[PDB]
Design a protein around this ligand. Sequence first.
Ligand SMILES: CCCCCCCCCCCCCCCCCCCC(=O)O[C@H](COC(=O)CCCCCCCCCCCCCC)COP(=O)(O)OCCN
Length: 508
Amino acid sequence: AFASLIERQRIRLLLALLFGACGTLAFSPYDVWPAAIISLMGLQALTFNRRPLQSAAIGFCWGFGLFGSGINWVYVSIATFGGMPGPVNIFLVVLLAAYLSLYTGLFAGVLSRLWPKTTWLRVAIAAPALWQVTEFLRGWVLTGFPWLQFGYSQIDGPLKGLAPIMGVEAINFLLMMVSGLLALALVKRNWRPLVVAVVLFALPFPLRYIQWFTPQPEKTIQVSMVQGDIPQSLKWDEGQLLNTLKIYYNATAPLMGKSSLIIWPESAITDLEINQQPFLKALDGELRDKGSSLVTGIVDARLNKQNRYDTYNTIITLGKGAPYSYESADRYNKNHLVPFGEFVPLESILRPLAPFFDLPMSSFSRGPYIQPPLSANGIELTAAISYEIILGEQVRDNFRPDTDYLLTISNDAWFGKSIGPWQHFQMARMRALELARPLLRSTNNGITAVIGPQGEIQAMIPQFTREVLTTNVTPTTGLTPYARTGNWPLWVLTALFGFAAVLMSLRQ
Ligand SMILES: CCCCCCCCCCCCCCCCCCCC(=O)O[C@H](COC(=O)CCCCCCCCCCCCCC)COP(=O)(O)OCCN
């Protein structure tokens, strides 16, 4: 009796959660990319033949089914490092999933208000355009949080070659268009939208065999990222500062003279750069003598015009090809700070409330949006500290044509053994794919890997293990169409589809 059961409001809301939860089965840990299409079909099929205010509830439940069932490793960072009652920890995660679901409830509500009837216009020209706008708002409002975008799920899939041409957000655009036409063919029991939903999904397949980069087997350095595996509950303690420096230095010494580039995780030196001055100067001379360059994440307290200490999450460079100096330009201050982890809203009421809102060294300051690429031993590194690697447009803007490797240092020790480090790792692979540059990802204990110029994992060391990822990586030169253009060509298509769909909605 499913013919009349589907029309009930409650049955569609509960089906929204199941199709919403099926979305998380497309990301890095469970890499079933078909689950991205099935989940998106549920968002569009379940909102068919619904009033505008009823589709918003369905869209909210689909979002809550995806962002509370696939973004819940935030609970690990709350229940293990912030001191709060258990119900309070659950409430924040639920609130985060509820907040992120508004931009999906907004999508479905507007979609069923301007395009009530179910047709190819609603699913293929209206939904992809409105999905881009609502996804953009989720990634722009309150500093944004562009997590769980189905474009990242196609890192190893048919829609792989589309990212180098128009970016990851184009895969989000195409997945929504294909899924909508796929759900239209199922609800209306038609076959013409099914054929279109296959042609649009098979045309970008040959694009994955096009290489926009020319590899250079001449600058083949031997990079070696040192995974310190420093516990997060002890990383910023005073008594661990001497120990953590010894752990990294001892592993770095055999690498000197044989590894051209050595990379340490984010905030590897937990002390202020001005405080740890003699250690860096002594380390710089040893690295330069043997012919090795070190890239390190450190905390800085650079002075400002107002003579106020503005703490920055920086990257310093030492050794050959980049002499270390406190006034050197080979730095990278972190720009997009993580909310509630690096900055606290208004820093006035929330911080005294709970220890979670007052984390060790969580009063950072933003840096310039565009910064020069790091230079180390004659290679240009485009840095992106941790969270910044998920921001495709910010990385592209800093991406100079002379960049040899994409650099990313992260500290994923917060999110336990959960799927958070993997989802973050999958997004980092997308940057290498669309910019056609090798990605040298280094983490405290997370997934340390050398992503190839196509999103392939050239090397990786086991997680939660204090190891060193010594490997040979060949830099690539060449500009992808995404690097040369960016997000504007997609927004023209969004505006072209959005303006050609709103007018056809006001016509009737
Ligand atoms: C009406 C709406 C109001 C807000 C609704 C939301 C509800 C708020 C409460 C729920 C959200 C809580 C999020 C807590 C995240 C804490 C984990 C951050 C730890 C961290 O920053 O580590 C850094 C690594 O970056 C990373 O590894 C980044 C990993 C990916 C981001 C993690 C999740 C971010 C969630 C952002 C939520 C934004 C909501 C609004 C859009 C570097 O760490 P370090 O070693 O340098 O040490 C520095 C410690 N100070």
